[PDB]
């Protein structure tokens, strides 16, 4: 009545099931994951193969999907393992593993293509001729929540200029201490944006209203826009927590096709839901149910990122390995 199957609840894995669905419905990622050359891999320690297995089961099982081989492969297996890590670290663990496994293959560079951006930050001395520029690659964008009404205010905060003056005067080395500015602008924004909302600070949880839109235009935060490719982003996933830091229940909302038809993914129960439940009902306020992670897809890349996946996208070598595994266990 959905067409989508859920993930088993097998312990306090917090954000993990939400993230797994989120990555699974990044269809371009999914197809590249299927292409990884894992035939030689040791199952009990291969996270690239365990992610293939999970995606295979999500695409083909009609019953809820287990993850125990996956949490074994990356070694988080104690009661509170997932409560000592956060979703940004698990994102990096999964994406870096699969990135490396595609090095040297037909899908090499898929992870950077989908997820890498570039920024530039600078220090410009106000009163002598010295500037330091720093270009670096990024993956996700951590957005400050506390004291920000909406995602626009957070991006404004992200790129707000900082005065280095008086007591925090920048030392320009040869020039000694100098008044300077520090600032930031994005050079590029990747096809898939993972925005991490800083609700869980230090240990606390900010439950305040934080408004985020269905279509998110970001041209204003680039150093140079172009026309006929505006940085216009479409909301794909809303990863949600309920509670006050202490444990809590984790759920993800997705419109997997990018068409604004939303579903709620609540471990083994995938149910269909209103757009209001996915968006405005996760703004929070003063409710303690609210987004901590948003996934946006660039409008110009959406058809690309959400390209149809068929059974023919999963190699035979892999299908046969996974079905043989099932034979053994039975």
């Amino acid at each position: 009545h959905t067409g989508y199957v859920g993930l088993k609840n097998q312990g306090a894995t917090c954000y993990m099931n939400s993230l797994l669905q989120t990555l699974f419905f990044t269809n371009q990622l999914r197809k590249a994951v299927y292409m990884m050359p894992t035939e030689g891999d040791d199952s009990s320690k291969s996270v690239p193969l365990a992610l293939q297995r999970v995606f295979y089961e999500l695409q083909h099982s009609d019953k809820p999907v287990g993850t125990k081989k996956l949490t074994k492969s990356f070694g988080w297996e104690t009661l509170d393992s997932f409560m000592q890590h956060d979703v940004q670290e698990l994102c990096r663990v999964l994406l870096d593993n699969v990135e490396n496994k595609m090095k040297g293959t037909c899908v090499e560079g898929t992870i950077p293509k989908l997820f890498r951006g570039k920024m530039v930050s600078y220090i410009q001395c106000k009163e002598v001729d010295y500037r330091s520029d720093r270009r670096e690659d990024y993956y996700d964008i951590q957005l400050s929540i506390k004291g920000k009404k909406n995602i626009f205010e957070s991006f404004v905060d992200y790129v707000a200029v900082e005065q280095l003056d008086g007591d925090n005067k920048y030392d320009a080395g040869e020039h000694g201490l100098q008044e300077a500015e520090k600032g930031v602008k994005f050079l590029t924004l990747p096809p898939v944006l993972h925005l991490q909302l800083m609700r869980f600070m230090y240990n606390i949880k900010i439950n305040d209203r934080f408004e985020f839109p269905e279509q998110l235009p970001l041209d204003e935060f680039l150093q140079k826009t172009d026309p006929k490719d505006p940085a216009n982003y479409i909301l794909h996933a809303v990863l949600v927590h309920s509670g006050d830091n202490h444990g809590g229940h984790y759920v993800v909302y997705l419109n997997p096709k990018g068409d604004g038809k939303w579903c709620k993914f609540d471990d083994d129960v995938v149910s269909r839901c209103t757009k209001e439940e996915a968006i405005e009902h996760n703004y929070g306020g003063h409710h303690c149910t609210n987004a901590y992670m948003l996934v946006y897809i660039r409008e110009s890349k959406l058809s690309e990122v959400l390209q149809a996946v068929t059974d023919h996208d999963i190699p035979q070598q892999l299908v046969e390995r996974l079905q043989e595994e099932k034979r053994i266990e039975a």
Binding site: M119, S121, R134, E136, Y139, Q142
Partner: peptide, 15 residues
């Protein structure tokens, strides 16, 4: 890690 001390692209260990 990025200029702002947030995590950047890839795996970078503990601060």
């Amino acid at each position: 890690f990025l200029x702002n001390x947030x995590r950047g692209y890839g795996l970078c260990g503990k601060k």
